[PDB]
Ligand SMILES: CCCCCCCC/C=C/CCCCCCCC(=O)OC[C@@H](O)CO
Ligand SMILES: CCCCCCCC/C=C/CCCCCCCC(=O)OC[C@@H](O)CO
Ligand SMILES: CCCCCCCC/C=C/CCCCCCCC(=O)OC[C@@H](O)CO
Ligand SMILES: CCCCCCCC/C=C/CCCCCCCC(=O)OC[C@@H](O)CO
Ligand SMILES: CCCCCCCC/C=C\CCCCCCCC(=O)OC[C@@H](O)CO
Ligand SMILES: CCCCCCCC/C=C\CCCCCCCC(=O)OC[C@@H](O)CO
Ligand SMILES: CCCCCCCC/C=C\CCCCCCCC(=O)OC[C@@H](O)CO
Ligand SMILES: CCCCCCCC/C=C\CCCCCCCC(=O)OC[C@@H](O)CO
Ligand SMILES: [Ca+2]
Ligand SMILES: [Ca+2]
Ligand SMILES: [Ca+2]
Ligand SMILES: [Ca+2]
């Protein structure tokens with residue numbers, strides 16, 4: 310388990326990469 | 335909970351994205 | 360130890376930087 | 385505490401931002 314602020318940051322970062330990929334595609 | 339260095343890195347990363355968004359807006 | 364979603368995000372981020380470096384090289 | 389792979393990724397990410405800032409400055 311992780312600090313909630315770390316889990317969030319991890320969610321934010323994954324979604325960021327997903328969005329970037331979909332925008333480039 | 336997380337290593338303090340991970341919590342910080344998570345803070346740094348969130349603030350980085352926030353600043354980037356506000357700069358682009 | 361970390362939340363599995365954090366470990367993944369960490370893997371994703373490391374691989375992302377690796378790929379970016381190899382693409383620029 | 386965190387998974388060692390997460391602590392590393394956090395180190396990698398902080399150093400990455402540091403280097404980027406110093407390169408832009
Ligand atoms: C492109 C659309 C805009 C995206 C904006 C992205 C910025 C999002 C802002 C960050 C939200 C982070 C939420 C963070 C939620 C943490 C919850 C907390 O209460 O626990 C604190 C712990 O440390 C105590 O153990
Ligand atoms: C755009 C403005 C400039 C932004 C610069 C961003 C770079 C910031 C530098 C990084 C600060 C990280 C602070 C890290 C704080 C960690 C605290 C520590 O004592 O615990 C170590 C643990 O691992 C032991 O369990
Ligand atoms: C360039 C090629 C495309 C790369 C796409 C990158 C996006 C990858 C998507 C993200 C996958 C994340 C997998 C996440 C796996 C988490 C496993 C889970 O079951 O546990 C949840 C815990 O929180 C419960 O404690
Ligand atoms: C610009 C110069 C080049 C920079 C390249 C950056 C890429 C660095 C590669 C990644 C190194 C990650 C090291 C990862 C070290 C993890 C240690 C491990 O043994 O534990 C595994 C745990 O999950 C078990 O609990
Ligand atoms: C160009 C913009 C790209 C932005 C991509 C990122 C967008 C992310 C948007 C918002 C997602 C917020 C998700 C925030 C999810 C927070 C999860 C949490 O805090 O954990 C709760 C704890 O009690 C359990 O660990
Ligand atoms: C283009 C530049 C963009 C830079 C965006 C990032 C700027 C971040 C600035 C500095 C914020 C430093 C915050 C550092 C916060 C450290 C928190 C910590 O180490 O935890 C203490 C432990 O005892 C509890 O877990
Ligand atoms: C321009 C695209 C660049 C994309 C770079 C990133 C690509 C990453 C690709 C996919 C890797 C997915 C790895 C996902 C690995 C998930 C590990 C996990 O969830 O932990 C399981 C737990 O039970 C134990 O902690
Ligand atoms: C444009 C390139 C920018 C690259 C910036 C990032 C460069 C990073 C370079 C390498 C640093 C590797 C640091 C790797 C440090 C690993 C720490 C670790 O695995 O923890 C050991 C555990 O037993 C305790 O938690
Ligand atoms: Ca906390
Ligand atoms: Ca430590
Ligand atoms: Ca933990
Ligand atoms: Ca969980």
Ligand SMILES: [Ca+2]
Pocket residue numbers: 387388
């Ligand atoms: Ca492990």
Ligand SMILES: [Cl-]
Pocket residue numbers: 310311312315335336337340360361362365385386387390
């Ligand atoms: Cl963690």
